[PDB]
Amino acid sequence: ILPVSMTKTSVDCTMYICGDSTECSNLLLQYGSFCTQLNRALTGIAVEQDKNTQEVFAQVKQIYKTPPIKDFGGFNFSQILPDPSKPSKRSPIEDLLFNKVTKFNGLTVLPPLLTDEMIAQYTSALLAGTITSGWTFGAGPALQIPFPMQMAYRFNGIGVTQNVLYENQKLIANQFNSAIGKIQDSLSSTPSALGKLQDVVNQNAQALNTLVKQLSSNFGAISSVLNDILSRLCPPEAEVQIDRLITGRLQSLQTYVTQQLIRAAEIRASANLAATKMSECVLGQSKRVDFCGKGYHLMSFPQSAPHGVVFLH
Amino acid sequence: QKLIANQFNSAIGKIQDSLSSTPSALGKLQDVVNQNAQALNTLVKQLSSNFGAISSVLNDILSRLCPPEAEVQIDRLITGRLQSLQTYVTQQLIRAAEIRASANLAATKMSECVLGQSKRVDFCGKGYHLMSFPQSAPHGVVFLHVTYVPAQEKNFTTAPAICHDGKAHFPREGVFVSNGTHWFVTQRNFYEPQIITTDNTFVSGNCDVVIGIVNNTVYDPLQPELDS
Amino acid sequence: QIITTDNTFVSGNCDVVIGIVNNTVYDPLQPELDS
Amino acid sequence: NVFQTRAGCLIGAEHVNNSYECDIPIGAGICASYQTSQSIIAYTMSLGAENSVAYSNNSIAIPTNFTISVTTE
Question: What does altering residue 182 to Y do (chain B)?
């Protein structure tokens, strides 16, 4: 399970720091371009989350689709392929992954560019290319090959002579089908599995809740509320009380945007790893030890999840 | 060889045409120039800000006022100009970590794509990697990744193994394929059909085990050569 | 190693290949079969 | 010329049923582009050309020729 993106927040820093007050808004202009460079930083973070998502999933140039006949030689992909029964055609494992991962003050959340139904069409195209054509759809045109003959090449790719597949094909197919069955049980019974993606949800929710709670702080002013200062005091002293709130609310946003820049760099390193696992594990057969799971790697299947990707190595 | 050499020479020619005609091509290097220029313009424009002082200009405060009040007006400028520099240095530390991650990737592409040949899919460009050439650029490196792309697919019937005289034969390298009437063994990444022989195939077990095995003769190269 | 039909594989006539050289390739069968 | 999207209310862009590569990204699968008489159009983005790979239990495709690609990173 790998993080790939995080919630695209944007903060109207004039509405966060001031909000409707023209008195505070004119004092905030004296600090120059701090508010425009906070917006510039959060916009760069937000545009990067779409790039992080595009680089992982959009590795396939064509939306490949699986045949109506499932003549895969005993291998059963039903739990990883799209389910036509569903309102959004996620797989049965992608439905578990989407079930198991779960104010007005200028703070806003922008939608991702790719909807979850577009991410699921990319995991479907990656997966349908992988099943019908092997690594060939990554390195050129998709060249069809029978799935038992693809796995016979995956066996030669680990130094196991390909007759070892054809002579054990029902055993290998049953072990694959059984191990794919255990994934649903393993995810359903292990809340700490999705915990790597749920922590992306929890950290960005906790960071916004901390940013909102910081509007209740005085920062040394007579009140935390800008309308108490503006209703009680007159400009010679009111502007001295408002500058304490501006200074603290501006430091509260500079803290948030710095934490989101550092957290975006961590999600980007994870999205670069997920994009590398997509190319080398899904579109190929990695020789790299423990890169595509613990064992001699045969192949991986991408499944989408909220803010992330899941590889079934 | 003449075809491969002409395709290589042509593909290198297209790089100059692409980089000459397309303005957005070097956009990853030009964005790194633009981000550092935007950060310095932002840092320098913040010297025109008052931060609540009587003037943005330190020589106005020091020419007009005297020490008790001058030091109050100057400390508003020190507070804001110091926060202006801490913001620049923090964003340059985060941007330097992004450039270092890109320099670590470029150093890994130098070692694995230029000094080697890479089995890693899509690491050294799309296609099966042949080789890469480093070209220097302002603040960056450009890799010209040469790759083999297979290009004219043809459909064949195929089989996992051949039944000869009870034995199941599997290809040593390559795939069994048929033109519709005759069976050949070909390498996997380029269609070059060979007659099926005890040289390009190996036995394991018999016709009973393999699902989708086909009955065809496997030629023994010794048999006619032994006495005729 | 002495060049033999075990160390080497055939593909087509001489004329396709730029810089091919004329040399004998030993067959491990024929002289041992004659002996 | 006024059009509700999951990104917000979009105004001055002509909604189009046909789908294209994403030119300007609006959000929630919507993009806009300038096209022919010219207008800014807005559309659900196309992820790529669709392809049923010609799979069966005994059909293989093998490439009879190649191209030497040079790509720039």
Answer: In strain: Theta/P.3
Asked if D24 reaches chain A (Cβ–Cβ under 8 Å), the answer is no
Residue B225: which of C11, C18, C29 has the nearest Cβ? C29
For residues C8 and C1, give the distance between their C-alpha atoms in angstroms, rounded to a whole number: 11
Helix A235-277 with A34-57: angle, nearest 10 deg = 20
Query: What b/e readout covers B177-213, taking b as 16+ CB neighbours within 10 angstroms?
Result: bbeeeebbbbebbebebbebebbbbbbbeebeebebb
CB contact under 8 A, B151 and D70: no
- DSSP string over A86-119: SSS---HHHHHHHHH----SSEEEEPPSS-HHHH
Neighbours of D60 (CB within 10 A): 26
- Residue B208 has which token pair? 């009973």
Dist CA B72 CA B63 (whole Å):
14
Backbone φ and ψ for B176, nearest 5 degrees, come out as -75, 135
Six-digit token string for B181: 């009437």
Angstrom distance (rounded) from CA A130 to CA A81 = 11
Resolution for this experimental structure (Å): 2.8
With an 8 Å Cβ cutoff, is D2 touching chain B? no
A199 Cβ partners below 8 Å, 6+ apart?
none
Experimental determination approach used: cryo-EM
**In 3-state terms, what secondary structure has residue A172?**
helix
Between the CA of residue B164 and those of B168, B206, B207, D36, what are the distances in Å? 7, 9, 9, 65
Q: Give the A:D interface size as CB pairs under 8 Å.
A: 90
Q: Print burial letters for D6-42: b (CB count within 10 Å at least 16), e (below 16).
A: ebeebeebebeeeeeebeebbbbbbbbbeeeeeeebb
Joined tokens for residue B85: 């520099």
Say which amino acid occupies B224: P
**Ramachandran assignment for A247, one of left (phi > 0), alpha (psi -120 to 50 degrees), beta (any other):** alpha
